[PDB]
């Protein structure tokens, strides 16, 4: 049983072939088979869309994969960048079995979560959230143009949002933070948009802040994974 | 007398509520500013009252417990006075500086002991004597049918009282304080709030900036502004020059543009006419 949490951490855990095998086949199948109440099939209709289209980009619904394969939507917010690595491989060869020439189109497909239940204010962040994924809001000041990185080359954009006005208190000031944009999502806003951002919390070393405050404190960002207008 | 309106509000703020507050740059705090003011302010024209001379709200003039009013006396005893004490003064030397020194040092010794310990509570007979004094000045008014008295005359006088009994080391206020609070309270509304027009002392300059002959004046002159307007009232709308001269050539005062203007202000507020540039229209 997947379940069976033993002697290792959970990303230790899903590293395993084993975890890593039903943890593939679960989510293969929860596409191929999740109905509506109605009885019509969700994905069918939604890859059929993205295909005509030619988008390369498939969104899913927290709420529905918690309500149908709870295990796989346990762990997701624990170890984000195993389980959406794991999701990504799923669901090109599902989209491959319904219209086999698509290769042609593209080689890779990334699947995007929403609606993700445990949202945080954009002040209250602390240590005990890193490395996990969270939900925030706000208003973008600063955006920097599209370039090129390295990987092969992808697109990547940089970002800084920050309180929504009146949402701070009277006469006080407002927190920010730096968010990154990567392949599609680039130019998914522009400057005084209000948004809603899914994404993963993430922190790294930098001379500039020991040297100014003189304590080994590090720097942090967010890597989007959905981005969305409220 | 010269500063602007920014700080006579914030000046208001602190003799009100003893306190000072701010906001800015996400600082928010409120502070405590109990602070005692003497102030030193500037325009003579014995034809008009203080108030009425210097530039400065009755909003402020009227928190002063005592005002007083300096100018020459054109006397020559005067005159011959004050220039014998300056040549006295030309001749200060140390039998007399020394002397006035150790007075100096035992007077601040006498201020920080009586403020150190001293503490006047009141007796029987001051509060007869404040209370008659409150009933003194209403009754002044009586005669005019107007309010000649209001509960902060009475903490001047209180205040006045406890100085002076404080000035004994007394540790009761008392008849002795009260009467000379009054004479100086007198004194002071003699000097400050005497109309020049009548010789008599006028509480509305104090609470409203003026004598109450100005009043009866602007009202007089928008009566007559309006019976003017009604004359013509087959026109709906005249000319604001023509008024003007109309106005002056009726009345035996020389009205100016600005006595002109608030009384058409005033019945612009009585709902009797709209002033639109050059024309003056009827409602």
């Given at each position: 049983?997947?379940?069976?949490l033993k002697?290792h951490?959970?990303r230790?855990w899903?590293?395993?072939?084993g975890?890593?095998?039903e943890?593939?086949h679960?989510?293969?199948?929860?596409l191929?088979?999740?109905?509506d109440?109605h009885?019509?099939?969700?994905?069918?209709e939604?890859?059929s869309?993205?295909?005509?289209?030619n988008?390369?980009?498939?969104?899913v619904?927290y709420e529905d994969?918690?309500?149908?394969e709870?295990?796989?939507?346990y762990?997701?917010?624990?170890a984000?960048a195993?389980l959406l690595q794991?999701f990504?491989?799923?669901?090109?060869?599902v989209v491959?079995?319904?219209?086999p020439?698509?290769?042609?189109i593209?080689?890779?497909?990334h699947?995007r979560?929403?609606?993700?239940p445990?949202?945080?204010?954009?002040?209250?962040?602390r240590?005990?959230?890193?490395?996990?994924?969270?939900?925030?809001?706000?208003?973008?000041?600063s955006?920097?143009?599209?370039?090129?990185?390295?990987?092969?080359?992808?697109?990547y954009q940089?970002?800084r949002?920050?309180?929504?006005?009146?949402?701070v208190?009277?006469?006080?000031?407002?927190?920010?933070?730096?968010?990154?944009?990567?392949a599609d999502?680039?130019?998914?806003?522009?400057?005084?948009?209000?948004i809603?951002?899914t994404?993963?919390?993430h922190?790294?070393y930098?001379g500039s802040?020991?040297?100014?405050?003189?304590?080994?404190?590090?720097?942090?960002?967010?890597?989007?994974?959905?981005?969305?207008?409220? | 007398d010269?500063?602007n309106?920014?700080t006579?509000?914030?000046?208001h703020?602190?003799?009100?509520?003893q306190?000072?507050?701010?906001?800015?740059?996400?600082?928010?705090?409120?502070l405590?500013?109990?602070?005692?003011v003497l102030?030193?302010?500037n325009p003579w024209?014995?034809?008009?009252?203080?108030?009425?001379?210097?530039?400065?709200?009755?909003?402020?003039l009227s928190?002063?417990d005592?005002?007083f009013?300096?100018?020459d006396?054109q006397?020559?005893?005067?005159?011959?006075?004050l220039?014998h004490?300056?040549?006295?003064?030309?001749?200060?030397?140390?039998?007399?500086?020394?002397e006035e020194?150790?007075d100096?040092?035992v007077?601040?010794?006498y201020?920080a002991?009586?403020?150190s310990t001293?503490?006047?509570?009141?007796?029987?007979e001051?509060s007869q004597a404040?209370?008659?004094?409150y009933?003194?000045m209403?009754?002044?008014?009586?005669?005019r049918g107007?309010?000649?008295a209001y509960p902060?005359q009475?903490?001047?006088?209180?205040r006045?009282?406890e100085?002076?009994?404080k000035?004994?080391?007394?540790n009761?206020?008392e008849?002795?304080?009260v009467?000379?609070?009054?004479?100086l309270?007198?004194?002071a509304?003699?000097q400050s709030?005497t109309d020049?027009?009548?010789?008599?002392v006028?509480?509305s300059?104090?609470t409203?900036?003026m004598?109450?002959?100005?009043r009866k004046?602007?009202?007089?002159?928008?009566?007559?502004?309006?019976?003017?307007?009604?004359?013509?009232?087959?026109t709906?709308?005249?000319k604001?020059?023509?008024?003007?001269?109309?106005?002056?050539?009726?009345?035996?005062?020389?009205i100016?543009?600005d006595?002109?203007?608030?009384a058409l202000?005033?019945?612009?507020?009585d709902?009797?006419?709209t002033?639109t540039g050059?024309?003056v229209?009827?409602?």
């Amino acid at each position: 049983n997947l379940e069976d949490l033993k002697g290792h951490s959970v990303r230790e855990w899903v590293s395993m072939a084993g975890p890593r095998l039903e943890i593939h086949h679960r989510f293969k199948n929860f596409l191929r088979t999740h109905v509506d109440s109605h009885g019509h099939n969700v994905f069918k209709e939604r890859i059929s869309d993205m295909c005509k289209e030619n988008r390369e980009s498939l969104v899913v619904n927290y709420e529905d994969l918690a309500a149908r394969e709870h295990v796989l939507a346990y762990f997701l917010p624990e170890a984000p960048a195993e389980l959406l690595q794991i999701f990504d491989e799923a669901a090109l060869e599902v989209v491959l079995a319904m219209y086999p020439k698509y290769d042609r189109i593209t080689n890779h497909i990334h699947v995007r979560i929403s609606h993700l239940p445990l949202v945080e204010e954009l002040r209250s962040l602390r240590q005990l959230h890193l490395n996990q994924l969270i939900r925030t809001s706000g208003v973008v000041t600063s955006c920097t143009g599209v370039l090129p990185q390295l990987s092969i080359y992808q697109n990547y954009q940089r970002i800084r949002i920050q309180e929504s006005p009146g949402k701070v208190a009277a006469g006080r000031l407002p927190r920010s933070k730096d968010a990154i944009l990567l392949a599609d999502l680039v130019d998914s806003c522009k400057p005084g948009d209000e948004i809603e951002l899914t994404g993963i919390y993430h922190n790294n070393y930098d001379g500039s802040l020991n040297t100014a405050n003189g304590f080994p404190v590090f720097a942090t960002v967010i890597l989007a994974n959905h981005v969305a207008k409220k | 007398d010269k500063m602007n309106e920014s700080t006579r509000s914030v000046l208001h703020e602190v003799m009100e509520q003893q306190t000072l507050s701010i906001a800015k740059a996400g600082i928010i705090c409120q502070l405590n500013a109990r602070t005692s003011v003497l102030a030193a302010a500037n325009p003579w024209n014995p034809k008009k009252t203080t108030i009425e001379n210097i530039q400065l709200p009755h909003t402020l003039l009227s928190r002063f417990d005592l005002i007083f009013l300096l100018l020459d006396p054109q006397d020559e005893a005067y005159d011959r006075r004050l220039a014998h004490h300056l040549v006295a003064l030309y001749y200060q030397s140390e039998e007399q500086a020394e002397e006035e020194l150790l007075d100096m040092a035992v007077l601040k010794d006498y201020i920080a002991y009586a403020h150190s310990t001293i503490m006047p509570r009141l007796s029987e007979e001051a509060s007869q004597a404040l209370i008659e004094a409150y009933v003194d000045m209403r009754k002044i008014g009586s005669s005019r049918g107007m309010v000649s008295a209001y509960p902060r005359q009475l903490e001047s006088l209180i205040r006045l009282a406890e100085a002076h009994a404080k000035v004994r080391l007394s540790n009761k206020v008392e008849a002795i304080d009260v009467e000379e609070a009054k004479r100086l309270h007198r004194e002071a509304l003699k000097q400050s709030a005497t109309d020049p027009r009548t010789g008599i002392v006028d509480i509305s300059i104090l609470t409203t900036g003026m004598s109450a002959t100005s009043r009866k004046r602007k009202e007089e002159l928008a009566e007559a502004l309006k019976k003017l307007i009604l004359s013509k009232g087959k026109t709906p709308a005249l000319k604001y020059q023509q008024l003007f001269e109309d106005i002056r050539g009726q009345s035996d005062i020389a009205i100016t543009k600005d006595m002109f203007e608030e009384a058409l202000r005033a019945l612009a507020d009585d709902d009797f006419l709209t002033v639109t540039g050059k024309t003056v229209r009827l409602l």
